[PDB]
Every structure is written in C-alpha cells, then in structure tokens.
Amino acid sequence: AGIIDQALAPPRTRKSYQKSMVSISGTRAVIETRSSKNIMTVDDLMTLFALFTLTVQYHDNKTPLYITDILSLRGKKDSGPARDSIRDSIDRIEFTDFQLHELTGRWLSENMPEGFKSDRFRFLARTITASEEAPVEGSDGEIRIKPNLYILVWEPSFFEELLTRDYFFLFPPEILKQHTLVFQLYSYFRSRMSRRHTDVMMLSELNQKLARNIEWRRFSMDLIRELRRLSEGKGSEDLFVVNLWGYHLTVKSIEEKGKVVDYQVDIKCDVEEVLRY
Amino acid sequence: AGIIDQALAPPRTRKSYQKSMVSISGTRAVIETRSSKNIMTVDDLMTLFALFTLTVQYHDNKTPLYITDILSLRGKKDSGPARDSIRDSIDRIEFTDFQLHELTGRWLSENMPEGFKSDRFRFLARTITASEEAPVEGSDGEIRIKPNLYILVWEPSFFEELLTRDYFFLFPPEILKQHTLVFQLYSYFRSRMSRRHTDVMMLSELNQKLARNIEWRRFSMDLIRELRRLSEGKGSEDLFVVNLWGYHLTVKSIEEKGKVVDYQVDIKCDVEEVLRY
Numbered sequence: 001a002g003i004i005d006q007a008l009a010p011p012r013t014r015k016s017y018q019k020s021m022v023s024i025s026g027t028r029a030v031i032e033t034r035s036s037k038n039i040m041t042v043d044d045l046m047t048l049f050a051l052f053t054l055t056v057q058y059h060d061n062k063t064p065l066y067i068t069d070i071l072s073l074r075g076k077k078d079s080g081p082a083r084d085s086i087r088d089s090i091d092r093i094e095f096t097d098f099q100l101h102e103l104t105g106r107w108l109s110e111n112m113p114e115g116f117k118s119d120r121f122r123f124l125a126r127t128i129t130a131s132e133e134a135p136v137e138g139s140d141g142e143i144r145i146k147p148n149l150y151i152l153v154w155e156p157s158f159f160e161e162l163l164t165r166d167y168f169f170l171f172p173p174e175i176l177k178q179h180t181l182v183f184q185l186y187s188y189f190r191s192r193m194s195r196r197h198t199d200v201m202m203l204s205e206l207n208q209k210l211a212r213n214i215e216w217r218r219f220s221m222d223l224i225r226e227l228r229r230l231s232e233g234k235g236s237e238d239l240f241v242v243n244l245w246g247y248h249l250t251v252k253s254i255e256e257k258g259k260v261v262d263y264q265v266d267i268k269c270d271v272e273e274v275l276r277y
Numbered sequence: 278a279g280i281i282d283q284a285l286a287p288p289r290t291r292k293s294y295q296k297s298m299v300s301i302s303g304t305r306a307v308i309e310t311r312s313s314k315n316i317m318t319v320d321d322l323m324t325l326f327a328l329f330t331l332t333v334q335y336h337d338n339k340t341p342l343y344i345t346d347i348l349s350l351r352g353k354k355d356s357g358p359a360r361d362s363i364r365d366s367i368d369r370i371e372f373t374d375f376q377l378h379e380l381t382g383r384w385l386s387e388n389m390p391e392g393f394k395s396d397r398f399r400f401l402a403r404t405i406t407a408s409e410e411a412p413v414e415g416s417d418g419e420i421r422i423k424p425n426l427y428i429l430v431w432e433p434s435f436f437e438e439l440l441t442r443d444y445f446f447l448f449p450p451e452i453l454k455q456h457t458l459v460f461q462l463y464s465y466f467r468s469r470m471s472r473r474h475t476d477v478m479m480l481s482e483l484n485q486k487l488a489r490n491i492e493w494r495r496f497s498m499d500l501i502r503e504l505r506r507l508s509e510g511k512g513s514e515d516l517f518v519v520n521l522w523g524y525h526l527t528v529k530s531i532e533e534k535g536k537v538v539d540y541q542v543d544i545k546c547d548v549e550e551v552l553r554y
Contacts, residue, residue, distance in 0.1 A: 129397075
C-alpha cells in the first residue's frame with residue numbers, strides 16, 4: 001500500500017506488465033505488476049482508498065459494498081458511464097498482481113545462509129458480485145459484468161491491517177472527491193513529510209516527484225487551478241494559501257520577465273490531520 | 278470448489294484464458310480461467326493436492342513449505358529439472374484466477390430480484406518465497422526466481438474449509454506419488470460411487486470416463502502395469518487384486534485371443550478408505 005503507489009500504470013494506459021525499480025530501507029528491489037487484463041493505473045488509487053474507507057466504516061471477513069456508496073464517496077454523479085468507470089477501476093484493482101523481488105541476499109536460517117525474498121501480493125483475495133443486467137459475451141467470448149453489489153475478501157494479513165492502524169489507509173472523505181493532482185499531492189504530503197513541520201519546495205520539482213511525464217504547462221495550470229479553487233480569497237494568482245486538510249500551503253509565483261514558476265511552503269498541523277476522518 | 282476439474286487446461290497446454298459451460302444445481306453457468314502467465318493444467322492437480330496435504334500436515338494463517346517436502350510427497354527425485362517442474366506447477370497454480378458467472382437471473386436481494394451472481398476465486402491469496410539463487414532477468418525482460426521456501430497464504434474461506442474439514446479433499450499421501458492414471462482412478466472412485474458397496478466395471482468404460490484422448494494400448498499397458506505392480510503376486514497376469522487405499526479391486530482378463538479388455542469388480546470400505554491418512 002505504501003510502495004504500490006510507485007508501481008502503477010500511467011493514467012488511461014492499458015497494459016498487462018510493468019517492471020519498476022524501487023529502493024526500500026536502502027535495499028534495492030524490483031517490483032513487477034502484471035494482470036490477465038489491464039493493470040492498475042494511478043487514477044485507480046483514489047478508488048482503492050475509497051474501498052479502504054468503506055471497509056472500515058462497515059466493520060463497527062467479507063465486506064459488502066454497494067456501487068452507489070462508492071459513487072457517493074468518490075463524489076461522482078450516478079449514471080451509466082460513472083458506474084462503468086468505477087466498475088473498470090475495481091476490475092483493474094481486482095486482477096492486478098504485485099511482486100517485490102529483493103536483490104540483496106539475507107540470512108534466513110542455518111539451512112539457508114543466503115536467501116533472496118520475493119513477495120507476491122494481491123489486494124482482493126476473493127470477489128463476489130451481484131448485477132442487475134445480464135453478462136455480455138464480448139469479443140473472444142470473454143465475459144463482462146456490470147455489478148451493483150460487491151462482496152470483498154481482502155488479503156488476510158492486509159485485512160488485519162485494515163482494522164488496525166487505520167491512518168495511512170484512511171484519507172479524508174473529501175480528498176477522495178478531488179482532482180487527481182490534488183489527491184497525489186495530499187498523498188505525497190501524508191507519507192513523505194513526517195520528518196518536518198515546515199518545508200520548501202517548487203512546482204518544477206513537483207512534476208518530477210509526482211507526475212513526471214505530464215508537461216510543465218499542463219501540470220502547473222491544472223494543479224494551480226485546483227489549489228486556487230480550494231484556496232482562500234485573500235490573495236491574487238501570484239500569492240495564495242490553501243488549507244488542504246491540515247497541510248497549510250503558501251504558493252508564491254516566481255517570475256523571470258513574464259514567464260512564471262511557483263513556490264510553495266507548507267506548515268504541517270498534525271492535529272487537523274487526525275481530525276480529518 | 279469441486280468444479281475446478283472442468284476449469285483446468287488440457288495437458289501440455291500453455292495458455293492464459295479458458296471458458297467452459299457448466300450446469301450446477303439446475304443453473305447454467307460459465308467458468309473462466311485466467312492468468313497473466315499460464316493457467317493450471319490437469320497435470321498440476323496432484324501438485325495442488327500435495328500442497329493441501331502439507332498445509333494440513335504443518336498445522337499439527339501462513340504455511341511454510343519446503344520444495345524438498347513437495348518433491349518427496351510427489352515422489353520426484355531431487356534434481357534441477359525436477360525443481361524447475363515443481364516450481365512451474367506451483368507458479369501456474371499461484372497465478373490462476375477462476376470465475377463462475379451465473380447466466381440465469383435469480384433472487385439475490387429484495388432490491389435485486391433476478392440478479393446475476395459471479396464469483397472470482399483464487400487458491401493462493403498471497404505467496405512469500407525464499408530463493409537461494411539470485412533473481413535472474415530472463416530473455417523476455419521479466420524476473421525469474423528459483424524459490425526454495427513457500428510461505429503460503431490461502432484464500433480465507435478455502436483455508437477455513439481446509440483446516441477444520443480435512444475429509445472432502447484429502448488423499449492418502451502415498452497416492453500423490455503414483456502414476457497419473459492411478460491418481461485419476463482413485464479420484465474417480467472418490468467423486469463417483471459415493472457410498473455404493475460394490476460395482477462392476479470395464480477398462481473401456483474407465484478409459485472413456487478417465488482418459489478419452491489416451492490410446493487403448495497405452496491405457497492397458499500403463500494402467501495394468503501400475504495396478505498390477507501395486508498388488509501382491511498371489512494372482513497371475515490374468516487375475517489379481519489391488520487394495521488401492523480402500524477401493525479393493527479385482528481385475529481379470531476377457532475375450533481370449535488377440536482381443537482383450539478387463540473386468541473390474543469394486544468393493545468400497547469407508548473405514549480404510551477414509552481412515553488412511
């Protein structure tokens with residue numbers, strides 16, 4: 001859940017294999033993501049977290065989640081294309097296998113002096129669905145369903161962590177309705193920013209840190225438009241501040257002659273973080 | 278479930294999708310078998326059952342299994358190609374998803390009458406592996422591992438069904454190392470003939486109900502060689518009896534010169550057959 005965000009597919013990409021290089025605790029590892037259909041994209045993250053929330057709120061095992069509650073938590077208007085979109089997202093999450101291969105040998109026991117560890121993980125161990133419409137056959141005869149009721153059986157150990165230490169798994173119900181760049185920014189501040197309470201960063205670094213292959217103009221215009229929409233009316237386009245559910249930002253534009261680059265400063269208020277449930 | 282036998286791939290087949298029509302309890306249904314690699318074949322069944330036995334034998338959750346125990350239980354001499362073969366069977370079992378789609382709408386919930394139910398199942402929810410050799414990047418650019426320790430995490434419902442009820446799918450460990458036709462014969466004797474005391478059969482009937490695509494020469498030579506092998510020498514080439522782990526058989530020759538077939542008299546004994554653990 002912490003490293004999976006680094007091994008997803010680009011948005012709107014339909015592929016069945018992706019090999020990414022990662023490093024955790026100094027240990028370099030190769031993370032593979034494969035599916036019999038299309039692997040998870042970055043945009044699916046939100047949907048995944050939605051499931052997380054709906055798994056925690058229900059238990060207060062097998063977790064029944066209705067499609068309408070998912071649409072509501074995602075802040076999307078109920079319609080055919082919307083239900084089909086969430087259905088495609090959950091379908092990508094369901095058939096995605098992650099596998100982390102550690103490249104540095106470790107000592108395990110007297111019988112295994114040098115041992116390389118690999119972990120093959122899958123979020124949903126089982127899924128039972130209930131649909132109003134009948135399945136369709138499609139090309140090659142492969143079934144396609146339109147479920148309204150989901151019944152999730154998570155991976156056991158992960159499920160035991162879905163009912164224990166529900167902080168990194170519980171995002172604010174309002175951040176799950178936000179833009180993809182806002183979600184990625186809040187998720188980046190939530191995991192890689194517990195070291196300090198004040199920080200200094202640029203938008204140019206934020207592309208390479210969050211959405212690299214997105215060009216600087218689209219990234220800056222979209223994310224700046226969103227943060228400006230969530231900002232307070234106190235400032236102009238050159239200087240404004242955003243609450244961001246505990247991550248009080250302070251964006252300031254830097255100009256050469258007419259061209260601009262933005263510069264943001266955050267002050268992490270840990271209280272409102274836990275308050276945002 | 279007990280319908281996976283109709284969902285597996287034919288022997289010597291390496292594919293990623295299969296679809297079958299299956300009627301269960303009067304309802305027409307479709308079973309799809311998917312894998313990002315190769316789906317399970319029939320010849321993997323024994324290995325799967327081996328895992329079963331070992332998972333029941335260790336807990337006497339997570340289940341550590343060593344490849345040495347799998348090779349010994351399957352009756353395989355420890356070597357390179359043997360370890361590779363077992364690893365390939367376990368790899369096909371690990372990445373195989375099954376899915377049962379009901380094509381007839383039935384009553385599911387007071388808000389979904391005549392709804393359509395699907396069930397996406399997977400034997401292994403999670404798999405941690407310990408390998409002695411280093412991860413190798415093959416010619417296809419994908420990581421290939423050579424594990425020796427299998428920390429297995431089964432599907433929760435199937436695991437609970439696998440720890441308490443150890444009588445539906447547990448075979449005598451000595452049958453997991455026999456010829457494939459003997460294993461198929463014993464499985465046919467446990468599935469069919471539920472509580473029938475005695476019955477009389479033909480090797481031709483056993484040929485068509487066990488291995489349709491096997492020549493009558495190889496069926497008689499292999500099956501009669503193995504059954505006649507596991508029998509006290511009290512008889513001759515034309516009359517012998519086999520215990521067969523609770524299914525006491527009696528095989529005799531038929532129809533004299535140049536044209537032959539075998540009578541097979543059975544007598545079921547639930548005491549020995551079930552108690553053999």
